[PDB]
Design a protein around this ligand. Structure first.
Ligand SMILES: COC(=O)CCc1nc2c(N3CC(N(C)C)C3)nc3c(F)c(-c4cc(O)cc5ccccc45)c(CCC#N)cc3c2n1[C@H]1[C@H]2CN[C@@H]1C2
Ligand SMILES: Nc1nc2c(ncn2[C@@H]2O[C@H](COP(=O)(O)OP(=O)(O)O)[C@@H](O)[C@H]2O)c(=O)[nH]1
Ligand SMILES: [Mg+2]
Length: 169
């Protein structure tokens, strides 16, 4: 079995906790405490490999300490999540990407762009906008719904595949 340290980042309210819990428990949790940062394991077979996915669901205040940088640096791959109904969350993606590159001291960190809440009608960030951003970074884009589970396995499993490709460079 191989362990993978996955970190879920993005603005408050994009569905980081709901995506994490959907992966771990196969159910949609409404209004999970917005302040709580925590880690969960999922054991899963991906392309024949038994994987131990340790998933950090980030929360809390915007703060930069040396300890906070050290903790983020333990991530092997990052899900950069926005919500398709929240333009400001999409505009925050650049920041999260740059902070990941800063703490990892690398231009090439495993990352997937996730557009969550795809079950909602009130879409303000179009598929093309997200695809173009992801193309500019050289990373995959996956649309997800933590409500319906659409795309959830794809998002996490694609991230694992991106880590495996990085390990081979
Ligand atoms: C809508 O408002 C919010 O979402 C407020 C909450 C929020 N905004 C931001 C933020 N924003 C809002 C913008 N402001 C300028 C207004 C930038 N950057 C953050 C950032 F760069 C780091 C950060 C610090 C660090 O040392 C190293 C890192 C390495 C990789 C990735 C991130 C970090 C961290 C800590 C680690 C993580 N993730 C938090 C940031 C943040 N937060 C909090 C909530 C929502 N996202 C996190 C949980
Ligand atoms: N319709 C819908 N609601 C979602 C989805 N993901 C999260 N939510 C809701 O959006 C709010 C914020 O989700 P949460 O998981 O707390 O976001 P976090 O702050 O990024 O951890 C909650 O009310 C969730 O129930 C989704 O894919 N679809
Ligand atoms: Mg949360």
């Amino acid at each position: 079995m191989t362990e993978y340290k996955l970190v879920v980042v993005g603005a408050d309210g994009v569905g980081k906790s709901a995506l994490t819990i959907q992966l771990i428990q196969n159910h949609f949790v409404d209004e999970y405490d917005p302040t709580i940062e925590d880690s969960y394991r999922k054991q899963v077979v991906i392309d024949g490999e038994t994987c131990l996915l340790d998933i950090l669901d980030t929360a809390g205040q915007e703060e930069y300490s040396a300890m906070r940088d050290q903790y983020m640096r333990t991530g092997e791959g990052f899900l950069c999540v926005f919500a398709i109904n929240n333009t400001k969350s999409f505009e925050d993606i650049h920041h999260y990407r740059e902070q990941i590159k800063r703490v990892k001291d690398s231009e090439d960190v495993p990352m997937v762009l996730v557009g969550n809440k795809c079950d909602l009608p009130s879409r303000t960030v179009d598929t093309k906008q997200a695809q173009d951003l992801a193309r500019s970074y050289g990373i995959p884009f996956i649309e997800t719904s933590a409500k319906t589970r659409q795309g959830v396995d794809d998002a996490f499993y694609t991230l694992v595949r991106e880590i495996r490709k990085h390990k081979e460079k």
